[PDB]
Structure formats: C-alpha cells, structure tokens
Amino acid sequence: HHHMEIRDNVFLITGGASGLGAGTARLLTEAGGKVVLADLNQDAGEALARELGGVFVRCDVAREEDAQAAVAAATKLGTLRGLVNCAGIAPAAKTVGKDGPHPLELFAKTITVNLIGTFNMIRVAAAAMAANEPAPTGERGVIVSTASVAAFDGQIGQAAYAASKAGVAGMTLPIARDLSRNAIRVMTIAPGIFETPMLLGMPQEVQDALGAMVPFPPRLGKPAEYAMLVRQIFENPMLNGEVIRLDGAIRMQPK
Amino acid sequence: HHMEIRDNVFLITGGASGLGAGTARLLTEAGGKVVLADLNQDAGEALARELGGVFVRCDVAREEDAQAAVAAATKLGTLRGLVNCAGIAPAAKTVGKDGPHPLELFAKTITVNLIGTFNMIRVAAAAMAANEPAPTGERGVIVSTASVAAFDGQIGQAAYAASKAGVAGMTLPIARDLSRNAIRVMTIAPGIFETPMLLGMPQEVQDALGAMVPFPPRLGKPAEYAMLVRQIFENPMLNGEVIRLDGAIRMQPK
Amino acid sequence: HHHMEIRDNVFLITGGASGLGAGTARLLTEAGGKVVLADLNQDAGEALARELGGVFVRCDVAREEDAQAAVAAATKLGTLRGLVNCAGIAPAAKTVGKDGPHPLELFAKTITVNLIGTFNMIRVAAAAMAANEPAPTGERGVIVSTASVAAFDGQIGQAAYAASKAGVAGMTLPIARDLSRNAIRVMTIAPGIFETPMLLGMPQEVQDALGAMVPFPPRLGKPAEYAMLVRQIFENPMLNGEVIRLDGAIRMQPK
Amino acid sequence: HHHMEIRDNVFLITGGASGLGAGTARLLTEAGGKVVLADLNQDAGEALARELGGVFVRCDVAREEDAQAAVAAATKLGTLRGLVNCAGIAPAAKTVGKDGPHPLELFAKTITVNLIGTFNMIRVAAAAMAANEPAPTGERGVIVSTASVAAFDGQIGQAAYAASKAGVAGMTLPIARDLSRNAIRVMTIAPGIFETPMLLGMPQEVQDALGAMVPFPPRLGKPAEYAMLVRQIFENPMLNGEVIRLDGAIRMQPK
Ligand SMILES: NC(=O)c1ccc[n+]([C@@H]2O[C@H](COP(=O)([O-])OP(=O)(O)OC[C@H]3O[C@@H](n4cnc5c(N)ncnc54)[C@H](O)[C@@H]3O)[C@@H](O)[C@H]2O)c1
Ligand SMILES: NC(=O)c1ccc[n+]([C@@H]2O[C@H](COP(=O)([O-])OP(=O)(O)OC[C@H]3O[C@@H](n4cnc5c(N)ncnc54)[C@H](O)[C@@H]3O)[C@@H](O)[C@H]2O)c1
Ligand SMILES: NC(=O)c1ccc[n+]([C@@H]2O[C@H](COP(=O)([O-])OP(=O)(O)OC[C@H]3O[C@@H](n4cnc5c(N)ncnc54)[C@H](O)[C@@H]3O)[C@@H](O)[C@H]2O)c1
Ligand SMILES: NC(=O)c1ccc[n+]([C@@H]2O[C@H](COP(=O)([O-])OP(=O)(O)OC[C@H]3O[C@@H](n4cnc5c(N)ncnc54)[C@H](O)[C@@H]3O)[C@@H](O)[C@H]2O)c1
C-alpha cells in the first residue's frame, strides 16, 4: 500500500461546476473516482455531472444546511475520501476608492464565501471522514483547499480576497493538527493565474499580457495542472499541513 | 527624522484592556492624545479619563461604530494612528466530541477579529487620507494585531488562526492600496502576553507557558507590545510587514 | 503534451548512492528514466548504478571539475532533463558549546557541501540544459533541490544545517527567475524526517518516538514518498520557484 | 527595568566603516554606547572610530583570528551587550550568463563574507556575552544580523546574494534557541534598498527610479532608519528569533 486509491472512492468538489473545480472533477473521474459537484451553478453543474457520471448538489458553501446536504450525498454515493474546496469569488475594490472606503458588505461577502465557506465544508466533511475506516496507507480522508498567491502577494484592490485566502492558508496547520488523531491530512494549494471563467471581463489582450509576466511557463495555468497537484496530494501520504504555490514562479506586483 | 507622536491623535480599538490599554498609556506618555474604542464602557471611560483622552463605545464589526470612533478622533485633533487590538480568542476543534466545530463560533471569531479590523482600517484610512502629510511624509500609520497563531495555529485554534492569518495577509495589499495616500500599514503578531485574554487559564498553566518561551522565559508585558507600536509609528521605512513579537517561541499542537 | 516525459530522458541525482537520492533514482528508473548517480560513495553508487542500468560518477558536489564530469556523463547518456540535488550532510553543534564556540570549519563545511555544492551542480547542469531543444511542454529541463524543514524550524544544534538549507530554499526564486528565459523550472523540497542513513546516529527508539511526534502519518517518511514529489515536480509544468514542505505537518521544537 | 541600557555599554559593529554599520555606530554613540567598529576599511574605520570616541579593529569577518580580536577589543572597552552584523557584499551574476555558468568563486565568496562571516562573528561574540552578568531586564546581550529582502524576493542575478541572506535569515531561530539558556536575543533585519556606498556604480537616475518603486516612502532608506530599528531590537526584551523586513513595502521584481 503506497498511496490512497482514487478509483472507486468518492470526492466532494466545491466550485465543481467551473474552472479549477471542474478540471479536478475531470481528472479524478478519469482516475476512476466518483465525484460530487457542489456549486451554485445548477445548469453547468448538472451538465458536468452528466458528462462525468457524478452527482450534482446545489450548494452555497457558506450555509450549514447546504454543506450537510453535499456531504450526505457523497457518503450515500460511497466512501468519502477527499474534499476539494474550489468555491470562491474574487472581487476587486480598494481600501479607499474613488467613492470612499471599501464597502463593508463586499469585504464580508468575500470572507464569507471564501473563508467561512471553506471552513464550513471542512468541518462537515471532516466529521464524516472521521467515521471512515482507514485506507491501507492510514488515511481516513484528505482535504485540499484553494488559497491563492494573493495570500502572500496581494495586489492593489485585493484586500478582501487576500484576507480571505491568507485565512485559508493560515488555518491549514491548525486543522491538520486538529484532524491528526482522525488520520485526515489537510493541504492547501495557492494558485497564481489560471485560465478559468474567474477571468471573464479581463479582455483577451490583458490575459495574454498577464501570461507573459509569468516567469515559466509564460502563460496562464490550465485547470488540469491544478488537478494534477490535487492528485499528488491525495497520493502522497507525507503531504500535510502545508501550502503549495502553483504559479510559474510569478510574484504579483501592486498593479 | 520621524513622525512625532506628540500632539497627534491615536485611535486604539480594544483600548480598555490588555495590549490596547498598554499602547494607550505609552502613546499618552509620548504626548499623543488617545481615543479608546471598546465594548467595555466602565474600563474604557476610566482609562480615557486617566490618560486625558476620549472613550467611544465601539463594536468594531459595526459600520456606524467605526464611523463614530473615527469621528471622535478627528474632532479631538489630527488622526495619525490606528491601532487595532480588539479581538477574541475562542477555542474549538474542527471535529469535537459532540460534532463539528460550530459554524457560528467560527463566523463570530472571523467577524470580530478580521472583518472588524478591516472595518476600522477602511474608515480610519479614509479620514487619514484627508490629512496634510506630516513633515516626514506620512498622512498616517495603521497598526493591526495578528498573532503567532497566524503561523503556528494550535489544536482548537482554527478560527482564531484563520482570522489572524487574514489580518497578517492583508497587510501588504492594504499598504499597496494606501501608498498614494502616504499611509503606512503594519502588523504585529504577538506570542503570549499577560493580559485578561488569559483569564480562565489558571496561574500554574500560565507560568508553565512562560517557561516554554526561549527568551525571555515569561509572558510578554503590554508595554513591550506598546514599544513596538511606537517604533512602527516612528520608523518611516516600516511598511507592509508582519513582525513576530514572541520571545522566539513556536507554538506546538498542544 | 501534458507533461515532461521521464521515459528515455536522463536524470542526474546527487547523493544518489543512498537515502532520498537512491529512492529518487529507483522511482525515475521504474518510470523509464536513465539515471546518473553522483556521490562520494564509490561502492554503493557503482552498485546502485549497475542495478538500475545507469551510470555512476564519483563526485564531490563542491568541486567544479566533479560537477563538470557528472554533467558530461549525463549528456553522453542522452538528453539531460532533470537534476535532483540530494547530496548533503547534517552535523550538530551549538553556537556556544560546553567547550567554546561552534567550530568555524564545521559551519563552513556544512555550508560548502549543502549550499555551495548544490549551487555548483545547478549552474553546470543548467548550462547543459540550456542547450537542449525544449520538450513539447516547453521545458528544456527541471531542477529540484533538497532543503529541510530546518530552513524554517531549526533546532538547538542545527545553526549550520539550517543556514545551509535556508540558503537552498531562498535561492529557488532568483534561480527560477535567472533560468526563465532558458525554460528551466527550479523547485525545492523541504523534507521533515525521513528514514535514511542520515539518521545512523539516532537510536531506533529515538527514531520511533520522533515518528510518533509527526501529526500525520505518525512515522518517518519513506524515500519513495520524497521521490513521488520529485516526479510530480517534473510532470507539472506550473510548479516553479517554490519550496514544498514534505513533513507530515510536523514543526520541529528546540529539542 | 523596562529595557537594556545602551549608555556606557559596548556594541561591536561589523561593516562599521560605512553605510548601515556606520549609521548604526553613530546612533548608538549618540545614545551613549561605546562602539567597536570591525571592517576591512582601515582608513575610514579608524577615522570614524575616532569621530565616535570608540575603537577600530581591522577585521575580516571570515577569519577566526579577526573575530577574536574584534571581540577582545570590545570586552577590553567595557561590557559587550550587542553585536550588529553589517559586513557584506552584493555582487551580481546570473546562474547561466552569456559566457557560461556563474563562476563558482563568486558564489563562494559571497556566501563566505555574508553568511559564514556573520556566523563567525556570532559564535565568538556569543561566547563572550555568555560570560556577562545579566542586565536588569535579564539579557546578557543581543545579536542583530543583516539579511536583505533578497532572502525572499531574490532578483535575476542575485542567486549568490539571496542564498547568503536567506541563510542569515534562516539561522536566526536556531541560534536564538541555542542562546536562550545564555539569555542572548538573536534577531535579523532584512532591509530593502538603502542609500549607502553599496549602490556605488548604480547611476543616480537608476537609484532615483528604484526609490520611486518603493510603495511608501517613495525613496531609498536612510542608514539612520536602519539604526533606529537596531535600537528598538536592543530595547525590546520580547524581540527574539525573528526577521523584520525594513523596506517601504517593496517586493522586488525579477528585473
Ligand atoms: N483562476 C485563477 O486565476 C485563480 C488563482 C488563484 C486562486 N483561485 C481560486 O481557485 C478557486 C477556483 O476558482 P476558478 O478559477 O475555478 O473560478 P470559477 O469562477 O471558474 O469557479 C468558481 C466556482 O465557484 C462557485 N461558487 C462561488 N460562490 C459559491 C458559493 N457560495 N457556494 C458554492 N459555489 C460557489 C462558482 O459558481 C463557480 O462555479 C477559487 O477559490 C479561486 O479563488 C483562482
Ligand atoms: N494576550 C495574548 O497572549 C495575545 C497574543 C497574540 C495576540 N493577541 C491579540 O491582541 C489583541 C489584544 O488582546 P488582549 O490580550 O489585550 O486581550 P484583552 O481581552 O485584554 O483586550 C481585548 C479588548 O478587545 C475588546 N473587544 C472584544 N471584542 C470587541 C469588539 N467587537 N469591538 C470592540 N472591542 C472589542 C475587549 O472588550 C477588550 O477590552 C487581540 O487582537 C488579541 O487577539 C493577544
Ligand atoms: N533524512 C532526513 O530526515 C532528511 C530530512 C530533511 C532533509 N534531508 C536532506 O535530504 C538530502 C538527502 O539526505 P539523505 O537522508 O538521503 O541522507 P544520506 O546520508 O542517506 O544520503 C546523502 C548522500 O549524500 C552523499 N554526499 C555527502 N556529501 C557529498 C558530497 N560533497 N558530494 C557528493 N555526495 C555527497 C553521501 O555520500 C550520501 O550518499 C540531504 O540534502 C539531506 O540534508 C534529509
Ligand atoms: N544598501 C542596501 O540597499 C542594502 C539592502 C539590504 C541589505 N544590505 C546589507 O546591509 C549590510 C550593510 O551594507 P551597506 O549598505 O552598509 O554597504 P557598505 O558597502 O556601505 O558597507 C559594508 C561594509 O562592509 C565591509 N566589509 C565587506 N566585506 C567585509 C568583510 N569580509 N569583513 C569585514 N567587513 C567587510 C565593507 O568594507 C564596508 O565598510 C550588508 O550586509 C548588506 O548586504 C544593504
């Protein structure tokens, strides 16, 4: 027994209707995993579930009842071995802008979806995973969350997003410590800039220009490359309590 | 050579107790005028009276309270400093005996410590941006309190660690946001300090904890946190950084 | 198309006669890679090269001419696509001991083997890789070095080792920036505690107790688990300029 | 009772003939401390030591005998309470240049002066401070070293400098741990960009342009501002085992 098996195990992916979550769903399905997609986007989520043979659950990650429903769907499908938190939003607003201070509700909403939502999915999924029998490598399950390089390199306009993502990154260690007796590993990925619908409203010129600023490779990341690192986290028993930058070595500048 | 504390106004959240109180005392001794913003009327009004400053009852999570506290400061004089010390430190495991960590406890910790700190920053920064620059160039300086839990989160600290990591992580983008306004933004990450936050931890356990600090082998004094605040106000090159103030301790899981 | 191929490409592994380097050589060889092992240990290195169908070079990583010889053996064998720096030593001595200060030569030697030696191998290998045609994914090659959690969590007695490994970790970014125009990715792994001959002086009992301190899994790392991460680095085109802790979420205490 | 006294105590400052070391010397003297300046620069060191009423010792920080002489001069002068490591060099060379790889000697020399040299001074000064009676605040002494933002943000051409300064940063914690029983605090300052002779051969336009990149204040740091932070570290009993960026919030880009 060298690593946790993806084949025939269940993986709950928030934000699974789009972008990195969708790419993760595709790779885990190709590996024989069974996916539960938890997202607000019912049309895309149901469609992807049909394409992959998974289950779609309409889920606002910030709500207790929705996290419960998503986790219960996964445990009904089979043995829940992985949570991948990809649900997130990335608004921009300066601390002091042209119209006065950053609106409070905008900061709160960003924190609520990205940080409180991620914790909400973690706590519910962890409670369920703790009831599993250990796999042959010892794990009851593995939790992967998505931060961002903004946790470390926050740009002008990203105070809220950075706060939320640094929150996600910072809680990796205490959660790993909390769940060590349950044999659940806890990891975070901090992506740089990836080609997903999160970038809709960045004109194609500006996207290509941003790709060109990445040291190597000089392009936006593919969702599959995120997914590849998720799989490695699942498969490597020693990866725990850590945040991994996945960013072509970029360091984001103020603008 | 540096921004003068003397004669300028300093808004200190959590200023009725502990680190905020200590900061208030030192800033007053340096000739600053303090506004103490806290939930605690009785302790806040006493200390403000003692220091010849002003107390404002302020829940840092509330927009209207933030506005009132900043307004008190701009009335008193030129607002040159915000020090965010308001915060709470609950303990609860991700998965407890009785089920998962309660969601509301997590949300409450995040709301006081992170959303509250941001709420004070945004309002205070808007007011500071209207100031004329001091002779050293600053319109103002914002200092926030994270914790070594931002980096060394222990068992039961997921909510506190998330909140404090948030505070630490936003230091840089807020510094970047306010660089055109000539406002510096810094964060102190304290280790373990002797304040009422340790009420409940019995004395033997506090002494044992002090003995785990490499040097000095004791709990931090509020004046020591306040010394670092004062350096941040006085040093024109400190911006966009998080400083651990912890006697070199690194917190273990338990 | 999706990642750099290990099969039929050449991998130069310093410290390849033992422990993490040897485990990396085994995994890369299983994946069809051709290995050059570079090590001081002639007997073990030659025996492992023979077993894996690779090449051994007796090489002190601190010497220019040894790095040159190791790189020349690799380029003879085929297309040099990866360097893995595992050559290292881990002495212990306090800054101020019972008998006086930490000896200067012990500090210097640690830094020379672990930090100067790693850079020596990198610069020579990178110069070779820079002359490669790019692979389909765009990389001319990929460099992986070994730091340690001691870069961040240095214990009493570890000033020299910590300095050296923090140096390895900190140079990852500028070297990735230097080699971005050459399309060479540069990454660092920071292992926690792994079961290798580096632990020879630690009694079995103290190894087992230290294993029990690792949050999860409560054991020492396997060389294969280090190797798995090296493979991920090679295969993921977005991993660049980063240091990855591989440590079961442990944080090292002073003692 | 609140903090260690600078007045009438002795401070050993390496690189004290120029720039940050010189500014430190001035500020500590103005506060009533007695300085020993340790530097290669005999003429400027002797002249400044005279100007400040202290002592100069020609000291190559990489040599054991020089460290010993410099520490001896300090303990003859009075009670040695602080060491400030400012001796350093910052050459530039790419990992792979136009003409071949980065010369090995250039990397080794940078590491030798900046890292080995800083450790050499620490171990000798620490052994001498360990023999002091504690000050009323409890310290026998305090050690301050100079890293750089290049420890974290290393630029193209800075592999050697970044390695050296990340080494200095990363050894802060184990050395603090080593010296805790001796009551000696150990700290590091990581400066951004400061107006000193280190920038000689950067033309004034390039210096002014780089100052304009500092988010706030939009200028180069003054040596006095470095020195102010050194004094805070001496006077704050709770600052230990930590690295402090002093940089106007800049993050250095590849070029
Ligand atoms: N694309 C990038 O460049 C990038 C870089 C760094 C980090 N990230 C983060 O990666 C993660 C994935 O984002 P992405 O690029 O795939 O963006 P995306 O917009 O394509 O996908 C995000 C998904 O999250 C869903 N979602 C939003 N709020 C939700 C909520 N309350 N409950 C449930 N689902 C919700 C959305 O409907 C969407 O389907 C996010 O956390 C994002 O912040 C992205
Ligand atoms: N004492 C320590 O060991 C330690 C260590 C690291 C960080 N901290 C942090 O330092 C800061 C100050 O803590 P302290 O030790 O002085 O604790 P404390 O309990 O003595 O003081 C905190 C103050 O915050 C006030 N407060 C709580 N919620 C508030 C709200 N919504 N609005 C306004 N005021 C509110 C309290 O009434 C109190 O007066 C906190 O952010 C704390 O998390 C403390
Ligand atoms: N084992 C652990 O717990 C652990 C943890 C963190 C980091 N590391 C690091 O991992 C790497 C591999 O260590 P390991 O555990 O496999 O130890 P190991 O002692 O089994 O293997 C180290 C190899 O490096 C060789 N070597 C030493 N100096 C050399 C030199 N100048 N030139 C060429 N070869 C040299 C040795 O002969 C040996 O074969 C090292 O850099 C080590 O510092 C190990
Ligand atoms: N100026 C900056 O922008 C900047 C930024 C970050 C870090 N630093 C670092 O600050 C420290 C001070 O640099 P500075 O700006 O004052 O430069 P500087 O060149 O003005 O002063 C450095 C001093 O170090 C002495 N020195 C060099 N090698 C020595 C050796 N082997 N032994 C003894 N002394 C030696 C020099 O003769 C010189 O007087 C260095 O460690 C430097 O790398 C400087």
Return the domain boundaries, chain C. 1-255
Atom of ligand 1 nearest to the CA of A21: 16
- In angstroms, rounded to a whole number, what is the distance separating the alpha carbons of residues D249 and D252? 10
- In angstroms, rounded to a whole number, what is the distance separating the alpha carbons of residues A165 and B169? 8
Residue of chain B minimizing CA distance to C213: B253
Residue A160, ligand 1, Cβ within 6 A: no
Instruction: Establish whether D88 is an annotated binding residue.
Output: yes
- Written in H, E and C, the secondary structure of chain A is CCCCCCCCCEEEEECCCCHHHHHHHHHHHHCCCEEEEEECCHHHHHHHHHHHCCEEEECCCCCHHHHHHHHHHHHHHCCEEEEEECCCCCCCCCCEECCEECCHHHHHHHHHHHHHHHHHHHHHHHHHHCCCCCCCCCCCEEEEEECCCHHHHCCCCCHHHHHHHHHHHHHHHHHHHHCHHHCEEEEEEEECCECCHHHCCCCHHHHHHHHCCCCCCCCCECHHHHHHHHHHHHHCCCCCCCEEEECCCCCCCCC
Asked if residue B40 lies in contact with residue B107, where contact means CB atoms within 8 angstroms, the answer is no
DSSP B36-96: EEES-HHHHHHHHHHHT-EEEE--TT-HHHHHHHHHHHHHHS-EEEEEE---------SEE
- CA atoms in the 13 A half-sphere facing the CB of D154: 35
- In angstroms, rounded to a whole number, what is the distance separating the alpha carbons of residues B214 and D24? 27
Distance B18 CA to ligand 2 centre (A): 7
Shortest Cα distance from B183 to chain C (angstroms)? 30
What is the longest distance spanned by two Cα atoms in chain D?
60
Tokens encoding C218: 């409560």
- In angstroms, rounded to a whole number, what is the distance separating the alpha carbons of residues D62 and D175? 18
- In angstroms, rounded to a whole number, what is the distance separating the alpha carbons of residues D97 and D28? 43
Asked if residue D215 lies in contact with residue D251, where contact means CB atoms within 8 angstroms, the answer is no
Residue of chain B minimizing CA distance to A178: B155
For this entry, resolution in Å reads 1.6
Identify the H or E element spanning D83: strand D80-85
Asked if residue D119 lies in contact with residue C107, where contact means CB atoms within 8 angstroms, the answer is yes
In the numeric block, the tokens 């990929």 are attached to: C142
Distance C222 CA to ligand 3 centre (A): 14
Asked if residue D16 lies in contact with residue D45, where contact means CB atoms within 8 angstroms, the answer is yes
- In angstroms, rounded to a whole number, what is the distance separating the alpha carbons of residues B137 and D248? 12
B145 DSSP β-pair partners: B188
**DSSP-derived secondary structure letter, D182:** G
- Catalytic-residue membership of B225: no
State the burial class of residue D104 (Cβ atoms within 10 Å of its Cβ: 0-12, 13-18, 19+).
middle
C10 DSSP β-pair partners: C34, C80
Tokens encoding D84: 């400030």
Choosing from C161, C191, C221, C252, the catalytic residue is: C161
Shortest Cα distance from C14 to chain D (angstroms)? 18
Identify the H or E element spanning D185: strand D184-191
Measured over the CA atoms of residue D150, residue D152, residue D153 and residue D156, the dihedral's sign is positive
Nearest to B39 by CA among B89, B104, B91, B85: B85
Tokens encoding B253: 């899981």
Asked if residue D185 lies in contact with residue D240, where contact means CB atoms within 8 angstroms, the answer is yes
- In angstroms, rounded to a whole number, what is the distance separating the alpha carbons of residues D79 and D90? 32
Shortest Cα distance from A194 to chain C (angstroms)? 10
**DSSP-derived secondary structure letter, D12:** E
Shortest Cα distance from D235 to chain A (angstroms)? 30
Nearest to C27 by CA among C200, C232, C187, C193: C232
- In angstroms, rounded to a whole number, what is the distance separating the alpha carbons of residues C118 and B35? 55
- In angstroms, rounded to a whole number, what is the distance separating the alpha carbons of residues B27 and B232? 12
Residue of chain C minimizing CA distance to B155: C215
Contacts of B214 in chain C (CB under 8 A): 254
Ligand 3, CB within 6 Å, residue ranges: C 14-15, 17-21, 39-41, 59-62, 86-90, 113, 117, 146, 148, 191, 193-194, 196-198
DSSP C97-134: ETTEE--HHHHHHHHIIIIIHHHHHHHHHHHHHTTSPP
3-state secondary structure of D203: coil
Technique behind the model: X-ray
State the burial class of residue B206 (Cβ atoms within 10 Å of its Cβ: 0-12, 13-18, 19+).
middle
Identify the H or E element spanning B125: helix B116-129
Torsion of CA A216, A218, A223, A228, to 10 degrees: -20
| Domain spanning B1-254, CATH class | alpha beta
- In angstroms, rounded to a whole number, what is the distance separating the alpha carbons of residues A135 and A133? 7
Q: Do C249 and A240 touch (CB under 8 A)?
A: yes
Q: Do B166 and A169 touch (CB under 8 A)?
A: no
- Bridge pairing between strands C80-85 and C10-14: parallel
B·D CB contacts under 8 A? 130
Nearest to A71 by CA among A22, A14, A111, A19: A14
Name all contacts of C100-106 with Cβ < 8 Å and 24+ positions apart: C100/D127, C101/D123, C101/D124, C101/D126, C101/D127, C102/C159, C102/C160, C102/D119, C102/D123, C104/D64, C104/D116, C104/D119, C104/D120, C104/D123, C106/C160
Q: Do B162 and A170 touch (CB under 8 A)?
A: yes
- In angstroms, rounded to a whole number, what is the distance separating the alpha carbons of residues D36 and D131? 19
Cross-chain CB nearest to C180 (options A3, A216, A240): A216
Residue of the CA atom closest to atom 36 of ligand 2: B14
A·C CB contacts under 8 A? 126
Residues of chain C in Cβ contact (below 8 Å) with chain B? 153, 215, 251, 253-254
Instruction: Establish whether C148 is an annotated binding residue.
Output: no
Atom of ligand 4 nearest to the CA of D193: 3
Asked if residue C223 lies in contact with residue C20, where contact means CB atoms within 8 angstroms, the answer is yes
Beta strands in chain B (DSSP E): 9-13, 33-38, 54-57, 79-84, 95-96, 99-100, 140-145, 183-190, 242-245
CA distances from B100 to A121, A175, C163, D10, D11 (A): 10, 12, 41, 57, 55
Distance C195 CA to ligand 3 centre (A): 12
DSSP chain C: --S---TT-EEEEETTTSHHHHHHHHHHHHTT-EEEEEES-HHHHHHHHHHHT-EEEE--TT-HHHHHHHHHHHHHHS-EEEEEE---------SEETTEE--HHHHHHHHIIIIIHHHHHHHHHHHHHTTSPPPTTS-SEEEEEE--THHHHPPTT-HHHHHHHHHHHHTHHHHHHHTGGGTEEEEEEEE--B-SGGGTTS-HHHHHHHHTTSSSSSSPBPHHHHHHHHHHHHH-TT--S-EEEESTT------
Mutual orientation of helices B171-178 and A159-178 as an angle, nearest 10°?
Answer: 170
All partners of chain A with 3 or more CB pairs under 8 angstroms: B, C, D
- In angstroms, rounded to a whole number, what is the distance separating the alpha carbons of residues A18 and C15? 44
3-state secondary structure of D184: strand
Q: Do D249 and B216 touch (CB under 8 A)?
A: no
Residue type, C211: G
Residue positions counted in chain C:
255
**DSSP-derived secondary structure letter, B134:** P
Residue of chain D minimizing CA distance to C101: D123
Residue of the CA atom closest to atom 34 of ligand 2: B38
Q: Do D126 and C96 touch (CB under 8 A)?
A: yes
- In angstroms, rounded to a whole number, what is the distance separating the alpha carbons of residues D239 and B243? 9
Torsion of CA B151, B154, B159, B165, to 10 degrees: 0
> What's domain D1-255's superfamily in CATH?
NAD(P)-binding Rossmann-like Domain (3.40.50.720)
Residue of the CA atom closest to atom 42 of ligand 3: C88
Nearest to B172 by CA among C128, C167, D32, D152: D152
Contacts of B248 in chain D (CB under 8 A): 173, 176-177, 180, 185-186, 240-242
3-state secondary structure of D117: helix
Interface test with B, best of A85, A95, A114, A164 (most B CBs within 10 A): A95
Q: Write b or e for each residue in A189-224: b if 16 or more Cβ atoms lie within 10 A of its Cβ, otherwise e.
A: bbbbbbbbebbeeeeeeeeeebbebbbbbbbbbbbb
Three-point CA angle A238, A241, A247, nearest 5°: 90
Instruction: Establish whether B111 is an annotated binding residue.
Output: no
Interface test with C, best of B148, B152, B249, B250 (most C CBs within 10 A): B250
All partners of chain D with 3 or more CB pairs under 8 angstroms: A, B, C
Residue of chain D minimizing CA distance to B173: D249
